[PDB]
Amino acid sequence: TCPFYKKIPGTGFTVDAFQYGVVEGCTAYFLTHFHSDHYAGLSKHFTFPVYCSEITGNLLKNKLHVQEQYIHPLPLDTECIVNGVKVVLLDANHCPGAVMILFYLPNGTVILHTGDFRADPSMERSLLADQKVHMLYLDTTYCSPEYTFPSQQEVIRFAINTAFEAVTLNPHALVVCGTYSIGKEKVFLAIADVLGSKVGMSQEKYKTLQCLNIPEINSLITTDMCSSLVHLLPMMQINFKGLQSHLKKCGGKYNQILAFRPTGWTHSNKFTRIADVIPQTKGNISIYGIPYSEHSSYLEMKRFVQWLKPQKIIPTVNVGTWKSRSTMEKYFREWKLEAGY
């Protein structure tokens, strides 16, 4: 059945709750972003109002064929009324089109649902600064102190420098980048930019990127693989067998692959700095795992929560085991005692 952490009390609303059939008492279904664990259940047959960002509404219409009459896109940073309740959508610093949602309940309670987010000090200057938030529905993906990772900018600098050096040493090297969802487009776009190439990809992935309102996108991507030396492939194909096979398909245009797998966290983060990352190599194929995250590190999460000072936290991730739930609740209490709220 629908879990309680997907329901907004005092409303008829749910968040990211499309796989439970008709939810009893739901008058509006919000969708924070276009990732499959969150949209699971949507299709052209859905006939309830869906509230979301413009970009998420482009993907629902073009990729899932949801009918336009049921898609309700809202502008960001703007007070809107939905079924009698004031809401605001805020940028979540996740994937394109991903939002956080502020609900202003009729009784005076204010609720923030973060969806999936990567906390940032810039958020401390949005419309969140303007009033008190009583309850927080929190993306707790990496809520444990082992989870450190570098800034997105440091990771992009590493990838650009690595790729430019490799292709300048060997003009016959191909760069490949893995993907299985929207997000992390900076990785492949930044590498293609330094090399003076467009990114080549399948028709399906091109269609998906053309929904994202990214500026000057017609200048950066293409479905012509032959004209491109940065190729995107399914994350599943980023392994030695998959890559050897791809290289056969390029007809002797290239004699080396340098590939990137933008993972979330990996336990090489506990020891190894970004400056010291090395690839896995077989023959003329090298694979780099780079820690490009679109979720909060532990310290990032902790700073946001100690700034916001919520009265109650409701985790939305890692809620399935008692040991995870108990560990998270111990951290929330530490943060509250350290900061004095």
What is the closest distance, in whole angstroms, from the C-beta atom of residue 11 to Ni ion in the complex?
Answer: 23
Query: Least distance to Ni ion from the beta carbon of 94, Å?
Result: 6
Least distance to Ni ion from the beta carbon of 296, Å?
12
Q: Is the Cα dihedral 72, 73, 75, 77 positive or negative?
A: positive
Please tell me the count of residues contacting Ni ion according to CB under 5 A: 2
CA distance 174 to 159: 14
- HSE-CB at 167 with a 13 A cutoff on CA atoms is 21
Q: How far is the CB of 222 from Ni ion (least distance, A)?
A: 27
Q: What is the rounded distance in angstroms from the CA atom of residue 309 to the CA atom of residue 323?
A: 25
What helix, strand, coil percent values describe the chain, rounded to 5?
35, 20, 45
Angle between helices 185-195 and 152-169 (to 10 degrees): 40
Contact (Cβ atoms closer than 8 angstroms) between residue 302 and residue 337:
no
Asked if 118 is part of the footprint of Ni ion (rule: CB under 5 A), the reply reads no
| Residue 300 is a binding residue for Ni ion (CB under 5 A) | no
CB of 140 to Ni ion, least distance (A): 13
CB of 2 to Ni ion, least distance (A): 19
Q: Could you give the string, one character per residue 19-58, with x where binding to Ni ion holds by CB under 5 A and - elsewhere?
A: ----------------x-----------------------
Closer to Ni ion at the Cβ: 33 or 198? 33
Using CA of residue 297, residue 303, residue 305, residue 308, what is the dihedral sign?
negative
35 or 205: CB nearest Ni ion: 35
Contact 195, 229 (CB under 8 A): yes
Are 84 and 74 in contact by the 8 Å Cβ rule? The answer is: no
Which stretch in 115-123, 142-150, 285-293, 330-338 sits in contact with Ni ion by CB under 5 A? 115-123
Q: Is 113 in the site for Ni ion (CB under 5 A)?
A: no
Q: By CB under 5 A, name the one of 116, 139, 185, 300 that touches Ni ion.
A: 116
Do strands 50-52 and 71-73 pair parallel, antiparallel, or not at all (unpaired)?
parallel
**Contacting residues toward Ni ion, per CB under 5 A:** 35, 116
